[PDB]
RNA sequence: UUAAUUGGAUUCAACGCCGGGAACCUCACCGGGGGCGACGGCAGGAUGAAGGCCAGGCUGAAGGUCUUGCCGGACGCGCCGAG
């Protein structure tokens, strides 16, 4: 069936399609890329590491070394 | 090298009804489309083909950051307001189908300084 | 200061130059557009000559 | 009108008729002032009594009731001063022309000065 | 041919009177009467936060409001019919009624 | 018209459209039965209502 | 840290607490745009006060204001008290 893919409604020919390894890989990458070329708010926060999907940040996702006063 | 949206040319994409373009769109759009527009956003359509057609030769400002964007407005700049400015968008193809606001941030990145007296449990 | 005026009124005759809105009764005066008759309270779209 | 208008004379029964029989009335009628008021009042019979005061300077709005007044029954009369004409019936100010539509218990005097006027000059 | 009454009273002893009369009327004439069924009793609970601002520990209030109820059958016969229309419930007594 | 500068919109849901019949706050409503009336109210008119507190 | 990241509470007896699960409203914060002075009196006001509008500019959008002229008739924040 045809919302059993991995890649329905292919952005550039329109079809559906399914990937595996590499060309899965450069797929993902290439998405990514095209977000951050138009200057779009996902891209700007995959290009600085900070969460996509409407997270709180004040308390959890800490990754670092503690800081004294 | 062209761009294509569902293997179809920017060209192709102007010669399309409103109902036909939807059915390309990701479903929040095609509902947002599917209920018809806000009257803003019927003004500020209003003022983009106006310009389209050769006339108002004045930059185009809105607060209608929720405006979807059309193959139609491609080749513009629009100043969409973020909270106390308007800021300047040029508008590309690959922008079809987003909303104007994902081009205006709103807040300002953060530079930590020094944590301050009471940060820890041992500077209060 | 006083807008009474252009119409027409000679020694003996009166007779308006701007007409009065057909919804309403006469007395009412459109304005001097000259595209259309602005007609001061309706409006109306006609392209008067 | 205004007094560099000649028209006719200065008859007192037109004065005592015109101002003395309009206090009794204010009470118990409606008054309109106003030049451009009365203009379509008098232009659609609105108005009953048009009491014309000759204040109005130049003959600009004034040269329309005279020129009007062929068209309709119109019973006019003339006020000679201005400043207690608002007095009569009205407000503490110069009035014009002060219309009466219906008023009570004063149509004998009214009716006699308007055909003296009718039988005086028309 | 039968006539269906209905009872809803916050106060017990009120519900208890007018039972007892509509009771005595069907039996100072000859008319069979189902007698008074009761219905269960509508329970309104309420529990509120008792501080006005947010300091303190938190302790609550527990209000509540009990309704009682009662049904009754009787067959229509004008002769009873009229003396039952004729009867005056307190104001704190609702009463319904109905022909099946 | 200048009187329109100061009317409001009129919203049917959301915390807006609901106000405290006897003191007019936002916020803290009680809802059940009926009842349009602030938590703070209901407190000190209660036993005016003919509830109790039995437990 | 920021234009603002509104405010109260700091041992038990502050920290899923203010019934506080805020997209608008709530809202008290930040950027911007409009509106409001019963009642006394002062300038002023039918030779018309105060107020309102078809179209088109300014504008995020707006008879808000301006351009263009049509409206209605007794009060009057341009001024001082007071609210
Ligand atoms: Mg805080
Ligand atoms: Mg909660
Ligand atoms: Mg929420
Ligand atoms: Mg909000
Ligand atoms: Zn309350």
Same mark, same amino acid.
């Given at each position: 069936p045809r919302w059993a893919v991995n890649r329905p409604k292919d952005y550039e020919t329109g079809r559906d399609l399914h990937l595996i390894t590499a060309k899965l890989d450069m797929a993902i990458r290439e998405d990514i890329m095209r977000l951050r070329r138009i200057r779009a708010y996902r891209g700007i926060r995959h290009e600085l590491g900070l969460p996509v999907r409407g997270q709180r940040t004040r308390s959890n996702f800490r990754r670092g070394q503690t800081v004294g006063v | 090298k062209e761009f294509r949206y569902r293997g179809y040319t920017l060209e192709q994409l102007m010669n399309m009804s409103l109902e036909e373009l939807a059915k390309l769109l990701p479903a929040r759009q095609r509902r947002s489309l599917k209920r018809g527009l806000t009257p803003e956003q019927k003004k500020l359509l209003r003022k983009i083909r106006l310009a389209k057609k050769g006339k108002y030769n004045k930059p185009i400002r809105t607060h209608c950051r929720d405006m979807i964007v059309l193959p139609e407005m491609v080749g513009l700049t629009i100043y969409v307001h973020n909270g106390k400015e308007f800021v300047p968008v040029e508008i590309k193809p690959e922008m079809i189908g987003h909303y104007l606001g994902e081009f205006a941030p709103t807040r300002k990145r953060v530079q930590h300084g020094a944590p301050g007296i009471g940060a820890t449990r041992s500077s209060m | 200061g006083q807008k009474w005026k252009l119409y027409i009124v000679k020694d003996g005759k009166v007779i308006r130059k701007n007409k009065f809105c057909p919804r309403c009764g006469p007395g009412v005066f459109m304005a001097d557009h000259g595209d259309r008759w602005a007609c001061g309270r309706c409006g109306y779209t006609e392209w008067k000559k | 009108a205004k007094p560099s208008y000649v028209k006719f004379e200065v008859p007192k029964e037109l004065a005592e008729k015109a101002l003395q029989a309009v206090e009794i009335a204010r009470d118990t009628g409606k008054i309109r002032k106003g030049t451009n008021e009365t203009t379509k009042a008098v232009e659609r019979g609105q108005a009953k009594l048009v009491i014309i005061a000759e204040d109005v300077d130049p003959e600009e709005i004034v040269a329309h009731l005279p020129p009007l007044? *062929? *068209?309709? *029954?119109?019973p006019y009369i003339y006020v000679p001063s201005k400043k207690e004409l608002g007095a009569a019936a009205g407000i503490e100010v110069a009035a014009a022309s002060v219309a009466i539509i219906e008023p009570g218990k004063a149509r004998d005097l009214v009716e006699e000065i308007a055909m003296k006027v009718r039988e005086l000059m028309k | 041919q039968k006539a269906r009454i209905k009872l809803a009273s916050t106060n017990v002893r009120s519900l208890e009177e007018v039972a007892n009369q509509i009771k005595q009327i069907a039996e100072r004439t000859g008319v069979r009467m189902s007698g008074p069924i009761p219905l269960p009793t509508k329970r309104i609970r309420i529990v509120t936060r008792k501080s006005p601002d947010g300091e303190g520990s938190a302790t609550f209030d527990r209000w509540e409001l009990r309704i009682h109820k009662r049904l009754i059958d009787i067959e229509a016969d004008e002769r009873a019919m009229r003396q039952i229309m004729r009867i005056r419930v307190p104001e704190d007594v609702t009463i319904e009624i109905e022909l099946i | 018209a200048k009187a329109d500068y100061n009317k409001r919109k009129p919203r049917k849901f959301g915390k807006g459209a609901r106000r405290c019949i006897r003191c007019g706050q936002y916020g803290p409503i009680i809802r059940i039965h009926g009842l349009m009336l602030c938590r703070h109210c209901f407190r000190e008119v209660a036993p005016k209502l003919g509830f109790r507190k039995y437990e």
């Amino acid at each position: 069936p045809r919302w059993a893919v991995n890649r329905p409604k292919d952005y550039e020919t329109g079809r559906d399609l399914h990937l595996i390894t590499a060309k899965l890989d450069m797929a993902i990458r290439e998405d990514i890329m095209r977000l951050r070329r138009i200057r779009a708010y996902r891209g700007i926060r995959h290009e600085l590491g900070l969460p996509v999907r409407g997270q709180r940040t004040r308390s959890n996702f800490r990754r670092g070394q503690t800081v004294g006063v | 090298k062209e761009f294509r949206y569902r293997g179809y040319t920017l060209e192709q994409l102007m010669n399309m009804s409103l109902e036909e373009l939807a059915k390309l769109l990701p479903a929040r759009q095609r509902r947002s489309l599917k209920r018809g527009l806000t009257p803003e956003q019927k003004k500020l359509l209003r003022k983009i083909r106006l310009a389209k057609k050769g006339k108002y030769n004045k930059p185009i400002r809105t607060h209608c950051r929720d405006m979807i964007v059309l193959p139609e407005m491609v080749g513009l700049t629009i100043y969409v307001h973020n909270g106390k400015e308007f800021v300047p968008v040029e508008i590309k193809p690959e922008m079809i189908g987003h909303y104007l606001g994902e081009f205006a941030p709103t807040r300002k990145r953060v530079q930590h300084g020094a944590p301050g007296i009471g940060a820890t449990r041992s500077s209060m | 200061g006083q807008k009474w005026k252009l119409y027409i009124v000679k020694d003996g005759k009166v007779i308006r130059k701007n007409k009065f809105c057909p919804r309403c009764g006469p007395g009412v005066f459109m304005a001097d557009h000259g595209d259309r008759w602005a007609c001061g309270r309706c409006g109306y779209t006609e392209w008067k000559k | 009108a205004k007094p560099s208008y000649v028209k006719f004379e200065v008859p007192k029964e037109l004065a005592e008729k015109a101002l003395q029989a309009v206090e009794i009335a204010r009470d118990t009628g409606k008054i309109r002032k106003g030049t451009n008021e009365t203009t379509k009042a008098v232009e659609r019979g609105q108005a009953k009594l048009v009491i014309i005061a000759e204040d109005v300077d130049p003959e600009e709005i004034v040269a329309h009731l005279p020129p009007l007044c *062929e *068209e309709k *029954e119109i019973p006019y009369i003339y006020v000679p001063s201005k400043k207690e004409l608002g007095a009569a019936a009205g407000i503490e100010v110069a009035a014009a022309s002060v219309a009466i539509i219906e008023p009570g218990k004063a149509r004998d005097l009214v009716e006699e000065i308007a055909m003296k006027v009718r039988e005086l000059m028309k | 041919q039968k006539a269906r009454i209905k009872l809803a009273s916050t106060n017990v002893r009120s519900l208890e009177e007018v039972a007892n009369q509509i009771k005595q009327i069907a039996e100072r004439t000859g008319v069979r009467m189902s007698g008074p069924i009761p219905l269960p009793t509508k329970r309104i609970r309420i529990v509120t936060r008792k501080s006005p601002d947010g300091e303190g520990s938190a302790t609550f209030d527990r209000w509540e409001l009990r309704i009682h109820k009662r049904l009754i059958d009787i067959e229509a016969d004008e002769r009873a019919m009229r003396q039952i229309m004729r009867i005056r419930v307190p104001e704190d007594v609702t009463i319904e009624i109905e022909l099946i | 018209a200048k009187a329109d500068y100061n009317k409001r919109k009129p919203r049917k849901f959301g915390k807006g459209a609901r106000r405290c019949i006897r003191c007019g706050q936002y916020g803290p409503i009680i809802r059940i039965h009926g009842l349009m009336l602030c938590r703070h109210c209901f407190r000190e008119v209660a036993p005016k209502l003919g509830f109790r507190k039995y437990e």
